[PDB]
Amino acid sequence: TLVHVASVEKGRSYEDFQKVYNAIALKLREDDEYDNYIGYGPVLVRLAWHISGTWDKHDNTGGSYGGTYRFKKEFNDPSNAGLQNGFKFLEPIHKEFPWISSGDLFSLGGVTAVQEMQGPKIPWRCGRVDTPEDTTPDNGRLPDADKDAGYVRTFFQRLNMNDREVVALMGAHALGKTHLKNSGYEGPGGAANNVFTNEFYLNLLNEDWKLEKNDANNEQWDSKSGYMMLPTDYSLIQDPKYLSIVKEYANDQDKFFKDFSKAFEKLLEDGITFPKDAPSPFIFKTLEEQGL
Ligand code: HEM
Ligand SMILES: Cn1cccc1CN
Numbered sequence: 001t002l003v004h005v006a007s008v009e010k011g012r013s014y015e016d017f018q019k020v021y022n023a024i025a026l027k028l029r030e031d032d033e034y035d036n037y038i039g040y041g042p043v044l045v046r047l048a049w050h051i052s053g054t055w056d057k058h059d060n061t062g063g064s065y066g067g068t069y070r071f072k073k074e075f076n077d078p079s080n081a082g083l084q085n086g087f088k089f090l091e092p093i094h095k096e097f098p099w100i101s102s103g104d105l106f107s108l109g110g111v112t113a114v115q116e117m118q119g120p121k122i123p124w125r126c127g128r129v130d131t132p133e134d135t136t137p138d139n140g141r142l143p144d145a146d147k148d149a150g151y152v153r154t155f156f157q158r159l160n161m162n163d164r165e166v167v168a169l170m171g172a173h174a175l176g177k178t179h180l181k182n183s184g185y186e187g188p189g190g191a192a193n194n195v196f197t198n199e200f201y202l203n204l205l206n207e208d209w210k211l212e213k214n215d216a217n218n219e220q221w222d223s224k225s226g227y228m229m230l231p232t233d234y235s236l237i238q239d240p241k242y243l244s245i246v247k248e249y250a251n252d253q254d255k256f257f258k259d260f261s262k263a264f265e266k267l268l269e270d271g272i273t274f275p276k277d278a279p280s281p282f283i284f285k286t287l288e289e290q291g292l
Pocket of ligand 1: 042043045046049081143144146152170173176178179180182264
């Protein structure tokens with residue numbers, strides 16, 4: 001029942017935020033060696049999700065608004081292991097643009113990464129305001145990966161996401177890789193892991209998956225092509241309701257893009273009250289669209 005009202009950084013408008021977007025995008029292009037040349041796109045998407053996914057609809061605790069990932073309790077959450085790389089990437093961006101709030105920066109990082117990786121446009125709204133250290137949510141609000149479809153479904157009800165929204169959001173798992181030292185899981189999900197596509201769904205349906213144990217003694221689904229799916233990923237083809245939606249996105253790139261864009265914006269905005277006279281959501285141009 002907490003209320004968080006969006007408050008525009010004083011005097012700022014679209015052009016200010018496009019400059020921040022551009023600085024993130026230029027650094028994504030420049031720092032290309034990260035994670036054996038995957039680059040920082042995937043980890044920035046994951047950061048934006050984890051700072052948002054602490055939200056609880058029941059009392060409006062957590063969520064992106066407060067920028068609380070900057071505090072030790074949250075940045076040391078075992079569920080956030082590896083995200084420090086994303087935070088470090090954003091540090092020089094914040095130094096250049098010290099006026100942007102932490103929640104705005106973390107969420108904008110995710111939007112920028114999706115778009116620069118040739119994903120859908122994600123409308124984005126400013127006005128998250130840093131809140132104090134005692135507003136940092138406790139660890140344990142982000143999801144476990146060893147679980148089944150019923151767990152996933154129930155988990156996401158706390159974030160006010162339905163089946164379609166869950167399956168759309170999970171398509172982000174096309175990106176990057178699991179790293180044994182971070183999460184106890186190892187490997188990429190496909191060949192296209194720094195360009196945003198519907199490959200997650202295609203690979204779920206088309207690869208021959210085998211349930212194996214990794215070197216951390218955890219089960220994961222592996223293919224001979226060298227890809228993997230988490231148990232929670234694979235649950236989307238075990239549950240008949242999720243399976244229908246996986247098939248839809250595997251067969252319609254545009255629909256996946258549109259549904260992902262809506263769900264990801266919603267995820268990043270959960271918990272925030274926007275005044276009726278707040279600016280409309282911004283749609284940033286990519287570097288490519290700007291000739292930059
Ligand atoms: C049931 C829900 C989810 C579970 C259990 C889950 C779990 C995981 C795990 C275990 C990793 C590997 C982390 C590592 O070892 O570095 C990962 C990576 C990732 N997750 Fe999720 N995740 C979920 C939902 C999502 C959502 C909703 C998004 C965004 C829309 C997302 C985006 C990502 C991205 C982009 C990576 C790759 C990060 C990198 O390459 O550094 N995940 N996830
Ligand atoms: C690449 N990735 C990220 C999370 C899970 C996976 C593999 N399907």
